[PDB]
Amino acid sequence: TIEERVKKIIGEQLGVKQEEVTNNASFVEDLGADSLDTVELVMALEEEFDTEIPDEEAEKITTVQAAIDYIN
Amino acid sequence: LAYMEGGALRSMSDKALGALRLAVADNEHLRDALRLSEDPKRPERKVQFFIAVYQHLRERIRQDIIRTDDPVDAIEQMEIELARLTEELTAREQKLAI
Amino acid sequence: AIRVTQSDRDLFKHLITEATSYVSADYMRHANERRTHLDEALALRGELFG
Amino acid sequence: MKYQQLENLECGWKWAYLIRKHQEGEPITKYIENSAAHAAVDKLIKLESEPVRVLEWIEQHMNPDLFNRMKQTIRARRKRHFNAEHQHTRKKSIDLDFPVWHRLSALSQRRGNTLSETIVQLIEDAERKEKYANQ
Amino acid sequence: MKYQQLENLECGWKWAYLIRKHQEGEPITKYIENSAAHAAVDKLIKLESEPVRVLEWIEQHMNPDLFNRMKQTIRARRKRHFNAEHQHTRKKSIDLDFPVWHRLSALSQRRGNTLSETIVQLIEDAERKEKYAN
Amino acid sequence: SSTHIEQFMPVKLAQALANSLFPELDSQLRAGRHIGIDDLDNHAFLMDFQEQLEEFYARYNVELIRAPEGFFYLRPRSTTLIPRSVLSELDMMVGKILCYLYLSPERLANQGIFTSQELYEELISLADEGKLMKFVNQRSSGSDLDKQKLQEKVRTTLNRLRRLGMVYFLPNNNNKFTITEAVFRFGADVRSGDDPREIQLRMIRDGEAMPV
Amino acid sequence: FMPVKLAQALANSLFPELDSQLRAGRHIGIDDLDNHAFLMDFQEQLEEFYARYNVELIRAPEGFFYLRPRST
Ligand SMILES: *P(=O)(O)OCC(C)(C)[C@@H](O)C(=O)NCCC(=O)NCCS
């Protein structure tokens, strides 16, 4: 499902544990993903669902909850 | 190594593999892992083989005092032991002469 | 005993150094090309959007 | 030269090729006598962990027939190994029925382009129809 | 059942396949102990030129996990052997650059056709477009 | 191929069984002899081909076992193809005492060379003289004739243990001996810091020690 | 190395019991069909194997096999 495909992508693009990645887990502070890491995470999220996102609306996404909210 | 380009990295990896081929011929499963590590589609294999090498040297530790399982750490203890054995060898040859 | 310990030390040293040499080189390569490909991809993305 | 030549890799490739050929039963050796051929093969087998000496074993006992096939196979293996790094440089193998392949090859030979180029032109015409339908 | 199965042929195929796998290092036999495995492999090696006994050998010492692979390999071998008689039934193998293959497979999956059917339809449409223009 | 050793036996096991040392070692082992570090050749032979010999001897339903101290021996199973036997209680007394002497520093001056008289003196020091004597003869009450009988019994048990490799008589003297690490087995009931009554059950379950 | 047929005889599953009974001095006659046939087949190698022990594997004129210990 989308709500677990998001975790699959986040965990395998940042290397963090599945347990660590909760809905409210922010990438930078909780998951530790920095500039390029977050860029690659958003690119992978784009690839998974074969869609595209605007630059500003994409950069607005900075958390698992926000990630799913824009994905779903 | 960060400065250099791909060509030099590839060349030195090839040289390292050449050294390994000699260094690994004795072993069977370690040699097989080394061989499998050559596929370019699965770079992670390389790392796995590296682990095996450690996973090998860990079991080559002789006795308890050298159980600094980190192989790079056992080198200093072993060098200490070689120096010690040198002194005992000097004493023993003197004893044999007398 | 001296012979055995010297052989063991030499084997350990050679194996460790050669394994590190073999692996770290390709690891650094892959990292460098990954950085370069990301840099290349950003410009294409930017042009595509407009 | 477009692909870097690595000695300790091409030597291993060559050794594996020789061993595979021998175990398939072919006469890699240039010797007609059984004893010398067996001895040369045994020495080659000993040369497993020393790919560097494999070039010399080739220059001393390799069958004169095999130079062309050898230089072809290792060249192709090098190309494939270097292309396998990235997907966009890889190749995909597909099988085609004889009528379909006959028509496609006739068309390609007509247009004087490779099969992939002919498929590109064809799929591009189809996609142009789709695009103009979409607009 | 479309292709008739011939014992003296399929059994030779099976023997060659098993010898190839053994030479490749695959564990042919179900015996973990090396002695029994080697003995069974020697029995197989000296068992050449025998269908009625290679079948029994397979039934008795064959590795459980290789049964499916051997069965499907023999299926493919039979089909290819029977199809290789006539030109029109043969199959031509080609290599396609990854982007071209990706687009072609996208079309084939989209339309539910096979690669051969998709390319046939596309070529027919290309000819039809030529006639339209001409 | 046929006429090929791997068909029937692994190469290393066959090499071990064809070595000149195999027959003496096998006869001694089946006789019940323990192997210590002192028999350098035999100990090294067991170490090199240790795994082949455990799997070979498994065919007899007997385990070739290396205790942590480093001494190999054979433990028959309930289904042993080689008969099995248990040491006498007096044998346990002398073995425990021998382990004590191995670990005892007071006798360090002896440098490992001990006489049966010293062993008996230590035995009587640590054990119950008359109540231990009870087993030598049911009607003993300290009679010196029975005292000599107990001394002779201790000497006989010491000889049997010598046969088992727990003790070596000196190249020229049968009245003096040197202890071997095998004696450590006599302490297997106390090497683990737990309740004695649970360790005894564990050992008897493992076949290490039957009761009396 | 080792003789091949000797390895075959030793590896045979009958070898442990027969070896124990021989080293116990038991005599193997014609009644023990399996053991007697095994000894008949593999005598040429068991004689050498038991001569390595300074013992002789003797087939009596009556036919039964046994082990005769030497002085050594
Ligand atoms: P991190 O601190 O390395 O930052 C990376 C980045 C956010 C600067 C980079 O991923 C990026 O977004 N670069 C392009 C910025 C942009 O909006 N350019 C316009 C289109 S080329």
Author numbering:
A (entry chain H1): 2 to 73
B (entry chain B1): 1138 to 1235
C (entry chain B1): 248 to 297
D (entry chain J1): 1 to 135
E (entry chain I1): 1 to 134
F (entry chain E1): 2 to 213
G (entry chain F1): 9 to 80
Please, what does the article write about this entry?
We then reconstituted a complex of MukBEQEF dimers, MatP, and an 80-bp DNA oligonucleotide containing matS close to one end in the presence of ATP and magnesium ions. In addition to dimers in the apo state, dimers associated with MatP and DNA were readily resolved. Because we positioned the matS site close to one end of the 80-bp DNA used for sample preparation, two dimers were able to associate with four DNAs in a “tetrad” arrangement. Different classes of tetrads allowed us to assess the distance between the two dimers. We observed dimers distantly bridged by the DNA molecules and closely apposed. This is explained by sequence-independent binding of the clamp, which can associate with any position along the DNA double strand. Since the DNAs are roughly aligned with the dimer symmetry axis, it is conceivable that DNA translocation may operate along this axis. The architecture of the MukBEF dimer permits binding of two double-locked loops, whereby the loop axes are parallel and monomers are arranged side by side.
The ring-like structural maintenance of chromosomes (SMC) complex MukBEF folds the genome of Escherichia coli and related bacteria into large loops, presumably by active DNA loop extrusion. MukBEF activity within the replication terminus macrodomain is suppressed by the sequence-specific unloader MatP. MukBEF is the SMC complex of E. coli and other enterobacteria. Its SMC subunit is MukB, which associates with the kleisin MukF (Woo et al., 2009; Zawadzka et al., 2018).
